[PDB]
Amino acid sequence: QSLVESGGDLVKPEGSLTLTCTASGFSFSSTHWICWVRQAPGKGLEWIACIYVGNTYDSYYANWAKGRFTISKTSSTTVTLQMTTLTAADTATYFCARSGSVFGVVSLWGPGTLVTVSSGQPKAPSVFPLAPCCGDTPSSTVTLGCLVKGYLPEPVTVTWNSGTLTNGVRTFPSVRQSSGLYSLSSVVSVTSSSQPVTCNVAHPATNTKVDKTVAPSTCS
Amino acid sequence: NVYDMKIECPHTVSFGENSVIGYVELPPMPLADTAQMVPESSCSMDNHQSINTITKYTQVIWRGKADPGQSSQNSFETVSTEVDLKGTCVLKHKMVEESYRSRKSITCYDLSCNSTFCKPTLYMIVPIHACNMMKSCLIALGPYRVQVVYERTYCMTGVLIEGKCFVPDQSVVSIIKHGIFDIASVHVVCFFVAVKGNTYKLFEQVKKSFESTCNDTENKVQGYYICIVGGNSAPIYVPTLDDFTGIFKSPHGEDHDLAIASYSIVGPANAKVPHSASSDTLSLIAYSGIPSYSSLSILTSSTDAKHVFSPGLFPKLNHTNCDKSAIPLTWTGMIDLPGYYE
Amino acid sequence: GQVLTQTPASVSEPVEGTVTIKCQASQSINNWLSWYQQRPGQPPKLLIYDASTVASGVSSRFKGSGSGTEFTLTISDLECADAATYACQSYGYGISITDNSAFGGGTEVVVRGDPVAPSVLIFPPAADQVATGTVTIVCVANKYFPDVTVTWEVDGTTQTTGIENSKTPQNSADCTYNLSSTLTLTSTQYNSHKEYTCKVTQGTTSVVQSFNRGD
Ligand SMILES: *[C@@H]1O[C@H](CO)[C@@H](O[C@@H]2O[C@H](CO)[C@@H](O[C@@H]3O[C@H](CO[C@H]4O[C@H](CO)[C@@H](O)[C@H](O[C@H]5O[C@H](CO)[C@@H](O)[C@H](O)[C@@H]5O)[C@@H]4O)[C@@H](O)[C@H](O[C@H]4O[C@H](CO)[C@@H](O)[C@H](O)[C@@H]4O[C@H]4O[C@H](CO)[C@@H](O)[C@H](O)[C@@H]4O)[C@@H]3O)[C@H](O)[C@H]2NC(C)=O)[C@H](O)[C@H]1NC(C)=O
Q: Ligand 1 centroid vs A7 CA: distance in angstroms?
């Protein structure tokens, strides 16, 4: 049992964007309620709207989102959420909610989707390798990593050796720069005798998948 | 978008201590807006102050089970809470007669609700003393406005039925003395009044009228229900007493099946009407769709009246097994009554 | 107008201790509250509903109490995996469907564990970076507690502009942090100075990792 949120791309200010929530392997039935919840980074949860998602139609919107948002059920497995005249304050993570009553207890959530409202254009990441200075004395264990520079919008995924290696992997959260661009860095520690490790940076927004491979012998 | 409440008046006024009643069914409104909703009347007869008073109700609601995993098995639970409802048709003992002698009206409403929306049915009981002046009145109930429209029928003291007047007479003795009478279906609106006492053993008489196994009647509700048959000589204290059954042949009221039908049956349920009982004491059927029938009922198996408000649930009104009991607060329908007319 | 107040904004309690979170409602809710656990980058998880009932699969160490307008949440036998963000939801039924429907502000729970010194690693900018014209230097501190402050010095002078810090959430095993500090400059500036120093201070303890350009 799960909920999946789609959509959520970079949208210009005063623009519009429509989100979609899908259910997996579970019919909607008639004793359930589907809802949308948003949460800005650094702020609490916010109610948006709900739908009875049954045979009869009745929906309720938030006071701030009334008239500006539009929620409706489409089929027996999907619901939508039309957003209009989005501003910078609407940049948040939008979750799909399932409850047994209107605005009630959320029995199951979803991973959530990010809606970035910014006037900038999408950009591809510029992956750089992270290696110690060549002047450093070789050690038994060495730490290497890949650096993902300015990109827009989020999310980007970094995996090492196509997910085969997980131990010793430390991926750091992204940080927004002055120009509204995000940067992420991830490092891994392996022995000098190990085979070269490959980091797989993937940016679904720009559809860029950079495969930079590093070896313990690599130096800056 | 004003709505009309028609009231019929006979030619002769004040033959007795009689009152007339009218009703109107209003379009659905949100359930949250029905709180603290009281009628504000503009008639020459001030509304009774006891109607606007607070009557403590038990709110019984249905919702999908909160526990995940069990929520995946689309099961639903019941929640019981105490709420305060004003303006509902909760009449007191001898309230109709005292209102008649005090020139005061009784304006109350019955609400038909699903889980989210309510269809209110406004009622007004006024003495026939307002049938001579026939002053038009305006009643405000929440976001709705109702125009009180008086229509003068061509009847001296009777009630207009299919273009003919009809007078129902009281007790068997009057019929025997008259030596001939006719019986026709007459519309009637009734309200239940609960009062404790020793002469109010309701269910010992309920078992007599129909074969229902209802033991331990002492701990059950005590009271009678007064109904208005419109026109003149309307007030009845208790039906079928043989001094003046049909309600329980069609306990759900006037036929109000939804009939395009976006109504979905969710399933039956049990709940605690006192909200403090050890176990469930009332059975209900949760539903989804357009609101229909009455969402208000009274638990019988309790001497003190336990008023029930069940939005989105249908209370069990069948006393065939006496189990999980409830009775409607208001009832509108047609019953055959003896009488005579010119 | 219904407003939901959740306190305290941030709480720091050690392992095996207790955590108290207060959630107060302006309007009475009649024992209708829910408590959620929200890990970073994760959907919130329901642990307490109806303000007293433990959800199936939730450990008994989570206890919810309160009724009316004041509620509290207590976490006993604190663990490292319990370090997350918690919030309370005020939900109503029947008449109170839209009268009292709001979400809590959110509380941050930090679990204090045995302090660990930070192993500091510094990475000079790659060859490909200097060609673009924008150059950044990455300095990281691994497996440390409590929080640290990072200082950047070039030829002895402390930098003030163009420094970004990203901190990993506490590990669910040892309650430790990981921090990455990035100092972004221009290629013209980077080719002027030689001594680049990353200084990580953990209270009184300071771990300094530096390198010289062209070495
Ligand atoms: C608790 O009760 C409350 C109230 O009792 C419920 O709330 C109500 O629920 C009903 C559903 O049972 C809602 O009715 C639906 O309204 C839809 C929206 O209508 C408005 O928008 C459309 C398009 O903009 C307008 O055309 C409508 O105007 C119509 O109505 C006015 C009168 O008000 C007329 O004058 C017009 O001429 C129009 O006729 C409204 O402005 C509406 O789309 C929907 O209609 C579908 O369903 C009916 C019933 O089955 C069909 O007859 C109709 O053809 C539509 O059917 C759809 O599906 C079929 C099959 O696939 C297709 O062939 C059709 O093309 C169509 O796509 C229906 O009328 C009502 O609006 C709502 N109240 C409010 C205030 O919104 C709660 O839900 C209930 N709660 C629970 C839990 O049960």
A: 28
